[PDB]
Amino acid sequence: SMSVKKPKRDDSKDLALCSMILTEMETHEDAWPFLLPVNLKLVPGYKKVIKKPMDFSTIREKLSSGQYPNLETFALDVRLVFDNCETFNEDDSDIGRAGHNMRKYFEKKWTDTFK
Ligand SMILES: Nc1ccc2[nH]ncc2c1
């Protein structure tokens, strides 16, 4: 509270570390459904169903331009990619499996790096 400061974690390396994690996701072989925005003109249903589209290239642009206030907002956008994937794809599909794989991959990197 006012004038009562909690010790806080050193956050000076957060930007660099999120960038490295995002690089590892960008170069994963199962990243292909997530590298660019879904084409809302060509994919039926996506625009109406998925209220907040997100993809790795958009996360990279936001990270590179100071649009994440902290590392938690970065993780929220990453998880949004995989939550959108589950909403729109059957678990059994190639894209559905890719999303579950990438989520697992991310969360381990996240835990190992920050927790
Ligand atoms: N053609 C095609 C098939 C499955 C898809 N999931 N998301 C986009 C998309 C496009």
Side-chain angles (χ1 to χ4, degrees), residues 1-4 6-7 9-12 14-114:
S1 67
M2 193 190 317
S3 298
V4 175
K6 187 207 248 108
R9 47 176 305 277
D10 187 354
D11 63 343
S12 64
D14 286 2
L15 184 59
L17 290 169
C18 287
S19 179
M20 295 175 52
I21 297 181
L22 181 58
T23 292
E24 298 170 351
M25 288 193 297
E26 282 163 342
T27 57
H28 192 298
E29 65 172 88
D30 291 344
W32 56 268
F34 313 114
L35 294 176
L36 300 170
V38 177
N39 186 323
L40 299 185
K41 286 177 189 252
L42 307 179
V43 179
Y46 207 88
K47 195 180 193 302
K48 177 59 173 282
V49 171
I50 300 300
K51 304 310 185 177
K52 308 171 160 192
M54 188 49 59
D55 70 278
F56 292 167
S57 76
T58 297
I59 295 170
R60 171 66 71 187
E61 183 65 33
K62 292 176 65 169
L63 193 63
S64 291
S65 61
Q67 294 188 61
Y68 295 115
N70 55 58
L71 73 177
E72 298 305 337
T73 57
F74 165 86
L76 287 170
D77 264 3
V78 176
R79 290 164 181 155
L80 179 57
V81 173
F82 305 133
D83 289 345
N84 287 346
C85 184
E86 281 196 49
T87 293
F88 203 80
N89 299 277
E90 287 282 345
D91 294 338
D92 202 2
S93 57
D94 290 290
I95 292 173
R97 277 188 292 275
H100 290 293
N101 287 355
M102 292 308 302
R103 186 194 298 272
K104 185 78 181 192
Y105 191 72
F106 172 69
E107 293 300 347
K108 170 178 182 61
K109 301 279 191 180
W110 191 253
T111 295
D112 290 352
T113 300
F114 292 116

